[PDB]
Design a protein around this ligand. Structure first.
Ligand SMILES: C[C@H](c1ccc(Nc2nc3c(C(N)=O)cc(F)cc3s2)cc1)N(C)C
Ligand SMILES: C[C@H](c1ccc(Nc2nc3c(C(N)=O)cc(F)cc3s2)cc1)N(C)C
Lengths: 169, 176
C-alpha cells in the first residue's frame, strides 16, 4: 500500500463546502478562504477506517471520532496528503480553527497563503488507564477533559486529512 | 485542474528512464522517490498548445524534457497550476538541460528533512533564440519565438513565458 492520493477542489455549490466553511468561520471569519480541497487517499482511508471499526467495537457507546483542525507549512502538504500524520510521539489537533490558524503552525507561504486541514481524528477515550492492565492506553490526550481545546494522537492511521483549507489574511 | 500523484516503483521502466536522465549529472545524490503527476486538464491544455506547435514549426522537434528544481512549498502549486505566471534571460520559468543545475540548493531548496525536489518537465521549447533580462515575453522572429535560451547552438537552459508550455510530468525527491 503506497497510498497515492488525488486532490479535488470543493466548489461552493457542494453541500460539504458550507459545512467546512461554517466550522472554519466560527473562529476564523476574519481570514478569507481562497479554496478548500478534498484529499482522496484510498489506502490511507481504508487504513483509517480499519482502526475505527476496531475502535468502535471496543469503546462501546463512545463516539470515537471528531473533526479537528491542523495547521501546517506549505511544504508539508504533499507529505500529509500521502502519509497522513503517521510517524509517546504526538501530533496536535485543534478544536477551533483560530488556534491552528496561528503563524507558528500554518506558516504563510511566498504568496501569503496559509494551510489548515479539517481532520477526522479518532480521539476515542481520552484524559489529561489501568494499573492492573498497563498495556491498555488512552487513544488520545487533551488539555482539558470537560472542555477541550486540543487533542494529541500517537498511533498510526488515527487521523485522516479529509479537507485542506487554503486561506490568507 | 485537479490532480493525482502516483508514486513509481523502482521496478517500473518509467522510474529507470527518469532516474537514468537525472543520474547523468546527479548520481552523487540519493533518490528517495519519483512520483508521476496526473493533472488531466493541464495535460490537455498542454497537448493542445503542442498540436498547434507541431503544425507550425515544420520539421522542428518542439518538445524537450528538462529539469526544474523548486522548494517543497511550491510543489502543490506546480502540481495544480503548472508553471503559470505566479512563477537574466527573460521573466519566465527557467528549465535546465542537466539535472545538476536544478539540483543547486537555491532552486531545489532543502526542506526541514533535508529533502530536495526536482521536476522532470515536458517543455515546448519549439523555436528559440538568445534571451535578455528585459524580456517578459519572447522576441519577435521578424520586425514570435516559442522559448529563449542562454546559448542557441549549445543550450544549457530554457525560459518559457506562457502557461501550458510545460507539464510537470515527474517529481524527483532526493537528498545529499
Ligand atoms: C511541523 C511539525 C510540528 C509542528 C507543530 C507542532 N506543535 C503544535 N501544533 C499545534 C497545532 C497545529 N494546528 O499545528 C494546533 C494546536 F491547538 C496545538 C499545537 S502544538 C509540533 C510539530 N514538526 C514535526 C516538524
Ligand atoms: C526556489 C524556487 C525557485 C525557482 C526558480 C528560481 N529561479 C531560477 N530557477 C532555475 C532553475 C531551476 N531548476 O529551477 C534552473 C536553471 F538553470 C536556472 C534557474 S533560475 C528561483 C527559485 N521557488 C522560490 C519558486
Amino acid at each position: 500500500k503506497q497510498q497515492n492520493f488525488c486532490v479535488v477542489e470543493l466548489l461552493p455549490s457542494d453541500p460539504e463546502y458550507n459545512t467546512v466553511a461554517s466550522k472554519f468561520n466560527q473562529t476564523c471569519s476574519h481570514f478569507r478562504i481562497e479554496k478548500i480541497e478534498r484529499i482522496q487517499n484510498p489506502d490511507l482511508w481504508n487504513s483509517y477506517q480499519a482502526k475505527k471499526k476496531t475502535m468502535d467495537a471496543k469503546n462501546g457507546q463512545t463516539m470515537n471520532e471528531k473533526q479537528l483542525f491542523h495547521g501546517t507549512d506549505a511544504g508539508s502538504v504533499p507529505h500529509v496528503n500521502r502519509n497522513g500524520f503517521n510517524r509517546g510521539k504526538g501530533t496536535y489537533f485543534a478544536v477551533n480553527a483560530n488556534y491552528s490558524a496561528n503563524d507558528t503552525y500554518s506558516r504563510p507561504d511566498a504568496n501569503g497563503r496559509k494551510h489548515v486541514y479539517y481532520v477526522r481524528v479518532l480521539t476515542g477515550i481520552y484524559t489529561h488507564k489501568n494499573p492492573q492492565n498497563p498495556t491498555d492506553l488512552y487513544d488520545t490526550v487533551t488539555d482539558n477533559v470537560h472542555h477541550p481545546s486540543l487533542f494529541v494522537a500517537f498511533y498510526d492511521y488515527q487521523a485522516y486529512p479529509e479537507y485542506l483549507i487554503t486561506f490568507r489574511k
